[PDB]
Every structure is written in structure tokens, then in C-alpha cells.
Write a protein that holds these residues in place. Structure first.
Motif, mmCIF file in Angstrom:
data_model
loop_
_atom_site.group_PDB
_atom_site.id
_atom_site.type_symbol
_atom_site.label_atom_id
_atom_site.label_comp_id
_atom_site.label_asym_id
_atom_site.label_seq_id
_atom_site.Cartn_x
_atom_site.Cartn_y
_atom_site.Cartn_z
ATOM 1 N N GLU A 89 43.638 -33.062 -60.680
ATOM 2 C CA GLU A 89 44.874 -32.539 -60.601
ATOM 3 C C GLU A 89 44.915 -31.354 -61.576
ATOM 4 O O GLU A 89 44.192 -31.322 -62.620
ATOM 5 N N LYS A 90 45.021 -29.962 -60.992
ATOM 6 C CA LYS A 90 44.998 -28.878 -61.702
ATOM 7 C C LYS A 90 43.467 -28.754 -62.153
ATOM 8 O O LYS A 90 43.431 -27.895 -63.240
ATOM 9 N N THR A 91 42.525 -29.014 -61.414
ATOM 10 C CA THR A 91 41.187 -29.067 -61.768
ATOM 11 C C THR A 91 40.671 -27.626 -61.568
ATOM 12 O O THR A 91 40.945 -26.924 -60.071
ATOM 13 N N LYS A 92 40.122 -26.887 -62.184
ATOM 14 C CA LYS A 92 39.325 -25.439 -61.898
ATOM 15 C C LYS A 92 37.932 -25.734 -61.858
ATOM 16 O O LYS A 92 37.319 -26.447 -62.540
ATOM 17 N N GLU A 93 37.369 -25.222 -60.616
ATOM 18 C CA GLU A 93 35.941 -25.525 -60.327
ATOM 19 C C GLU A 93 35.176 -24.451 -59.834
ATOM 20 O O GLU A 93 35.624 -23.697 -58.865
ATOM 21 N N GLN A 94 33.988 -24.060 -60.443
ATOM 22 C CA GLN A 94 33.174 -22.854 -60.005
ATOM 23 C C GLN A 94 31.754 -23.241 -59.963
ATOM 24 O O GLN A 94 31.435 -23.765 -60.732
ATOM 25 N N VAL A 95 31.318 -22.833 -58.727
ATOM 26 C CA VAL A 95 29.749 -23.277 -58.290
ATOM 27 C C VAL A 95 29.024 -21.966 -57.897
ATOM 28 O O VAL A 95 29.818 -21.316 -57.195
ATOM 29 N N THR A 96 27.819 -21.919 -58.362
ATOM 30 C CA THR A 96 26.949 -20.982 -57.920
ATOM 31 C C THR A 96 25.698 -21.808 -57.606
ATOM 32 O O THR A 96 25.154 -22.482 -58.349
ATOM 33 N N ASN A 97 25.340 -21.650 -56.269
ATOM 34 C CA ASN A 97 24.221 -22.654 -55.945
ATOM 35 C C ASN A 97 23.135 -21.647 -55.323
ATOM 36 O O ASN A 97 23.544 -20.804 -54.564
ATOM 37 N N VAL A 98 21.774 -21.824 -55.563
ATOM 38 C CA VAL A 98 20.731 -21.112 -55.045
ATOM 39 C C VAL A 98 19.649 -22.135 -54.634
ATOM 40 O O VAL A 98 18.920 -22.339 -55.620
ATOM 41 N N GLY A 99 19.499 -22.496 -53.303
ATOM 42 C CA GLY A 99 18.677 -23.502 -52.994
ATOM 43 C C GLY A 99 18.702 -24.707 -53.536
ATOM 44 O O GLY A 99 17.691 -25.736 -53.315
ATOM 45 N N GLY A 100 19.492 -25.226 -54.319
ATOM 46 C CA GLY A 100 19.817 -26.594 -54.847
ATOM 47 C C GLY A 100 20.991 -27.460 -54.140
ATOM 48 O O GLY A 100 21.596 -26.722 -53.083
ATOM 49 N N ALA A 101 21.372 -28.506 -54.695
ATOM 50 C CA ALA A 101 22.353 -29.377 -54.131
ATOM 51 C C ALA A 101 23.457 -29.721 -55.047
ATOM 52 O O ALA A 101 23.353 -29.931 -56.283
ATOM 53 N N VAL A 102 24.647 -29.282 -54.802
ATOM 54 C CA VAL A 102 25.721 -29.773 -55.473
ATOM 55 C C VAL A 102 26.698 -30.425 -54.927
ATOM 56 O O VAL A 102 27.089 -30.042 -53.878
ATOM 57 N N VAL A 103 27.053 -31.595 -55.597
ATOM 58 C CA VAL A 103 27.845 -32.525 -55.134
ATOM 59 C C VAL A 103 29.057 -32.916 -56.022
ATOM 60 O O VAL A 103 28.707 -33.282 -57.200
ATOM 61 N N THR A 104 30.179 -32.599 -55.686
ATOM 62 C CA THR A 104 31.385 -32.827 -56.494
ATOM 63 C C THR A 104 32.498 -33.754 -55.816
ATOM 64 O O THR A 104 33.873 -33.633 -56.297
ATOM 65 N N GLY A 105 32.068 -34.217 -54.728
ATOM 66 C CA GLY A 105 33.334 -34.807 -53.851
ATOM 67 C C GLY A 105 33.039 -36.393 -53.831
ATOM 68 O O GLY A 105 32.603 -36.997 -54.847
ATOM 69 N N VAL A 106 33.957 -37.008 -53.210
ATOM 70 C CA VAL A 106 33.933 -38.714 -53.186
ATOM 71 C C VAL A 106 33.354 -38.970 -51.948
ATOM 72 O O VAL A 106 33.336 -38.579 -50.854
ATOM 73 N N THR A 107 32.296 -39.847 -52.459
ATOM 74 C CA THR A 107 31.551 -40.537 -51.086
ATOM 75 C C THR A 107 31.476 -42.071 -51.586
ATOM 76 O O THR A 107 31.272 -42.652 -52.745
ATOM 77 N N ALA A 108 31.930 -42.707 -50.432
ATOM 78 C CA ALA A 108 31.999 -44.121 -50.405
ATOM 79 C C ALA A 108 31.217 -44.758 -49.333
ATOM 80 O O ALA A 108 31.417 -44.485 -48.127
ATOM 81 N N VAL A 109 30.161 -45.328 -49.634
ATOM 82 C CA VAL A 109 29.124 -45.925 -48.441
ATOM 83 C C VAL A 109 29.001 -47.363 -48.806
ATOM 84 O O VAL A 109 28.753 -48.112 -49.845
ATOM 85 N N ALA A 110 28.982 -48.197 -47.627
ATOM 86 C CA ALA A 110 28.760 -49.534 -47.538
ATOM 87 C C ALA A 110 27.748 -49.673 -46.484
ATOM 88 O O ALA A 110 28.010 -49.410 -45.195
ATOM 89 N N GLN A 111 26.682 -50.661 -46.850
ATOM 90 C CA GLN A 111 25.776 -50.869 -45.914
ATOM 91 C C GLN A 111 25.477 -52.447 -45.712
ATOM 92 O O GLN A 111 25.000 -52.912 -47.039
ATOM 93 N N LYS A 112 25.307 -52.803 -44.841
ATOM 94 C CA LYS A 112 24.934 -54.231 -44.489
ATOM 95 C C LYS A 112 23.932 -53.961 -43.616
ATOM 96 O O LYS A 112 23.788 -53.988 -42.386
ATOM 97 N N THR A 113 22.688 -54.670 -44.122
ATOM 98 C CA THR A 113 21.317 -54.594 -43.151
ATOM 99 C C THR A 113 20.828 -56.289 -43.253
ATOM 100 O O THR A 113 20.609 -56.833 -44.327
#
Lengths: 79, 79, 79, 79, 79, 81, 81, 81, 81, 81
Positions: A37-61
Motif C-alpha cells: 500500500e502506497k509503496t514507492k519503488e524505484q529500480v535501475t538495473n544493468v545486466g543484473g536481476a531484480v525481483v520484487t514480486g510474489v512467487t509461490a512455487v510448489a513441487q512434488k517430484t
């Protein structure tokens, strides 16, 4: 024999109400809640990886060696 | 034999109400709650990894050696 | 035989109400709550790893040697 | 035989109310609560690892040698 | 035989209310609460490891030698 | 007066709000208001006799879940004027 | 007066708010208001006799879950004018 | 007067707020208000006799969970005018 | 007057707030208000006889959980005008 | 007057707040207000006889958990005007 991750329920009656239930959860992601809520977010990326989201992973092997469930936000520059 | 991670429930009656229940959870992520309110966030990245998000990973593996569940936010530059 | 991580419940009656329940949790992450309010955050990264987020990892492995559940925020530059 | 990490409950009655319950928790992370309020945070990173977030890792392994549950925020430069 | 980490409960009655319950916790992290309020934090890192976050790791291993539960914030430069 | 300005940038956001009243939000939540869950009654022998005159009577095995917002919530309500 | 300004940047955000009233938010939460969970009654023998005149009577095995917001919440309510 | 300014940066944020009233927030929480959990009654023999005149009577095996917000909360409420 | 300024940086944040009233926040918490948990009554023999006139009577096996906010909370409430 | 300034840095934060009232926060906590936990009554023989006139009577086996905020909290409340 062998049992692994088994839910066994057995019920016996003669009169009345009988409830028998089995449940199994294997490699489950359940209930991921996120609020920004009301989050300010500023990113500059040069050849790298920026992850700020939601990731939900389930794996059964079964019968799987070297399994990677989640590889998030990385730089791989092997030789 | 062998039992590993087994939920066994057995119930017997003659009259009335009978409830029998089994539950199993193996490699489960449950209930991840996150709030960001009025957060200011500034990132400059050059060839690296920046992770600021929510990652929820569940992994259940049978017969798997060398398994990595989550590899988050890294730089791998092996030779 | 062998039992490992077993929940066994047995109930017997003749009249009335009977409740029988088994539960097992193996490699479970449950209830991760996080709040960031009015947080100011500034990052400059050059070829490294910066992790400031929420990571919730659960892993259940059978017959797996060398398993890594979570490898978060690292620099690996082996030779 | 052999029993390891077993919850066994047995109940017997003739009349009335009977409750029988078994519970097992193996490698469980439960209830991680974190609040950052009005936190100012400034990071400069050059080729290193900076970890300031929340990491909750649970691992249950059977028959696994050399298992690492969590490796967080490191620099590995082996030869 | 052999018993290790077993919760055994047995109850017998004829009339009334009967409660039988078993509980086991093995390798459990429960209830980690952390608050940072109005904290100012400044980091400069060059090739090292800086860890200032919350890490909650639980590991249950059977038949595993050389297991490391948590390796947090280190520099490994072996030869 | 409330002013926001962003001059001479590459990316620029300008937000200005006079008044603001935020609301309620449930995200991934569960509510239970007036809930009856898991009731088990066993009665081998039951006799009910009711002689009512102008009133309210409730007998037997009752499982009642009520959610009343802007009125009276009762099981038996005998009002007389 | 409330002013925010961002001049000569690459990325610039300018936020200005006169008044602000935040609200309620439940995230991944669970509420239970007026809940009856897991009631078990065993009665081999039960006789109920009710002689009511202008009143409110509740007997037997009652499992009641109520959530009243802006009124009276009762089981038996006998009001007379 | 409340002023915030950010001049000559690469990344710049400017926030200004006159008044602010934060709200309530439940994150990963659990509430229980007026809850009856796990009641077990065993009565081999029960006789109830009720002679009511203009009143409120509640008998038997009662499991009541109430959540009243802006009114009276009762089991038996006999009010007379 | 409340002023914040950040000049000539790479990353710059400027926050200014006139007044601020923070709120309540439950994070990973558990509340229990008016809760009845785990009641077990065993009564082999029970006889209830009630003769009520204009009043409030509650008998038997009662498990009551109440959460009243802005009113009276009672089990038996006999008010007369 | 309240001023904060950060000039000529690489990373710079400037915070200024006129007034501030912090709130309540429960983190990983547990509250219990008005809770009845684990009551066990065994009564082989029970006879209840009640003769009420305009009053409030509560008898038997009572397990009551109340949480009253801005009103009277009673078991039996007989008020008369």
C-alpha cells in the motif's frame, strides 16, 4: 511393504452417524497473502536481476534427483 | 515393513456419532502474510542480484539426491 | 518393522460420541507474518547479492543426500 | 522393531464422550512474526552478500547425509 | 525393540468424558517474534557477508551424518 | 493547498491528494460470524410436551446460527403490546 | 500547505497528501465471532414438559451461535408492554 | 506548512503529509470473540419441567456463543414495561 | 513548519509529516475474548423444575461465551419498569 | 520548526516529523480476556427447584466467559425501576 505419506482412516459402527475422512498434502503452497500500500519503488538495473514480486512455487517430484523447485532472481555466468 | 509419515486413525462404536480423521502435511508452506505500507525503496544494480519480494517454496521429493528447494537472489560465476 | 513419524490414534466405544484424529507435519513452514511500515530502503549493488524480502521454504526429502533446502543471497565463485 | 517420533493415543470407553488425538511435528517452522516500522536502511555492496530479510526454512530429510537446511548470505570462493 | 521420541497416551473408562492426546515436536522452531522500530542501519560491504535479518531454520534428519542446519553469514575461501 | 511536482527526470511520478479515507480490505483472510460447527447429540429417549398460549416455545435439539445486523436476534421472542 | 518537489533526477516521485485516515486491513487472518465449535452431548433419557403463558421458553439441547450488531441478542426474550 | 524536496539525484522520492491517522491491521493473526469450543456433557437421566408466566426460561444443555456489538446480550431476558 | 530536504545525492529520500497518529497492528498474534474451551460435565441424574412469573431463569448445563461491546451482558436479566 | 537535511552523499535519507503518536502492536503474542479453560464437574445426583417472581435466577452447572466493553457484565441481573 512400505508406506510413506499415507493417511489411513477406518471407522465401523452399527447405528447412528459415521464420518471417515483422509487427507494428504505433499508439496503444497497454501495461503500466500501480500499487500503493498502506497509503496514507492524505484529500480535501475544493468545486466543484473531484480525481483520484487510474489512467487509461490510448489513441487512434488518422485524419482527425481537434482530437482530445483525455485530459482528466483539470479545471475549465472558459469564457464 | 516400514512406515514413514503415516497418519492412522481407527474408530469403532455401536451407537451414536463417530468421527474418524487422518491428516498428513509433507513439504507444505502454509500461511505467508506480508504487508508493505508506505515503503520507499530504491535499488541500483549492476550485474548483481537484488531480491526484495515474497517467495514461498514447498518441495516434496522422493528418491532425489542433491535437490535444492529454493535458490533465491544469488550470483554464480563458477569456472 | 520400523515406524518413523507416525501418528496413530485408536478409539473404541459402545454408546455416545467418539472422536478419533491423527495429524502429521513433516517439513512444514506455517504462519510467517511480516510487516514493513514507512520503511526507507536504499541499495547499491555491484556484482553482489542483496536480499531484503521474505522467503519461506519447506522441503521434505526421502532418500536424498546433499539436499539444500534454501540457499538465499550468496555469491559463489568457485574454481 | 523400532519407533522414532511416534505419537500413539488409545482410548476405550463404554458410554459418554471419547476424544482420541495424535499429533506429530517434524522439521516445522511455525509462527515467525516480524515488524519493521520507520526503519531507514542503506546498503552498498561490491561483490559481497547482504541479507536483511526474513527467511524461514524447514527441512525434514530421511536417509540424507550432508544436508544443509539453510545457507543464507555468504561468499563461497573455494578452489 | 527400541523407542525414541515417542508420546504414548492410553485411557480407559466406563462412563463420562474421556480425553486422550499425544503430541511430538522434533526439530521445530516455534514463535520467533522480532520488532525493529525507527532503526537506522548503514552497511558498506566489499567481498564479505553482512547478515542483519531474521532467519528461522528447523531441520529433522534421520540417518544423516555431517548435516548442517543453518550456515548464515560467512566467507568460505578454502583451498 | 497540496502540491507535488517532478521536474527534469527520466521517469517522474507526481501524486497529490487533498483528503483520503482508506477502507477495509481482507486479503487471504477467513471470517466466521455466528457459526455452529460440529455439534453431535445422542439421545436414546426423548419426550417433549408443550402447552403454549400466546407465547414462544422452542424445544428439542436446536442448532441455530444467527447473524442479525440491525435488529433483535432471538430464539424465542414473545413480545406483547 | 503541504508541498513535495523532485527536481533534476533520473527517476523521481512526488507525493503530497493533505489529510489521510487509514482503514482496517486483514491479511492472511482468521476471525471467529460468536462461534460454537465441537459440542457433544449424550443423554440416554430426556423428558421435557413446558407450560407457557405469554412467555419465552427454550429447552432441550441448544447449540446457538449469535452475532448481533445493533440490537439485542437473546436466547429467550419475553418483553411485555 | 510541511515541505519535502529532493534536488539533483539519480533516484529521488519526496513525500509530504499534513495529517495522518493510521488504522488497524491484522497480518497473519487469529481472533476469537465469544467462542465455545469443545464442550462435552454426558447425562444418563434428565427431566425438565417449566411453568412460565410472562417470563423467560432457558433449560437443558445450552452451548451459546454470542457476539453483541451495540445492544444487550442475554440468555434469558424478561423485561416488562 | 516541518521541512526535509535531500540535495545532490545518488539516492535520496525526503519525508516530511506534520502530525501522525499510528494505529493498532497485530502481526502473527492470537486473541481470545470471551471464550469457553474444554468443559466436560458428567451428571448421571438431573431433575430441573422451574416456576417463573415475570422473571428470567436459566438452569441446566450452560456453556456461554459472550462478547458484548456497548451494552449489558447477562445470562439471566430480568428488568422491570 | 523541525528540519532534516542530507547534502552531498551517495545514499541519503532525510526524515522530519512534527508530532508523532505511536500505537499498539502485538507481534507473536497471545491474549486471553475472559476465558474459561478446562472445567470438569461430576455430579451423580442433582435436583434444581426454582420459584421466581420478577427476578433473575441462574442455577445448574454454569461455565460463563464474558467480555463486556462499555456496559455491565452480569450473570443474573435483576434491576427494577
Amino acid at each position: 511393504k512400505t508406506k510413506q505419506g499415507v493417511a489411513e482412516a477406518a471407522g465401523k459402527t452399527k447405528e447412528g452417524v459415521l464420518y471417515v475422512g483422509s487427507k494428504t498434502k505433499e508439496g503444497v503452497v497454501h495461503g500466500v497473502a501480500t499487500v503493498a500500500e502506497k509503496t514507492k519503488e524505484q529500480v535501475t538495473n544493468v545486466g543484473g536481476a531484480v525481483v520484487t514480486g510474489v512467487t509461490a512455487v510448489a513441487q512434488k517430484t518422485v524419482e527425481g534427483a537434482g530437482s530445483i523447485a525455485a530459482a528466483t532472481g539470479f545471475v549465472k555466468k558459469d564457464q
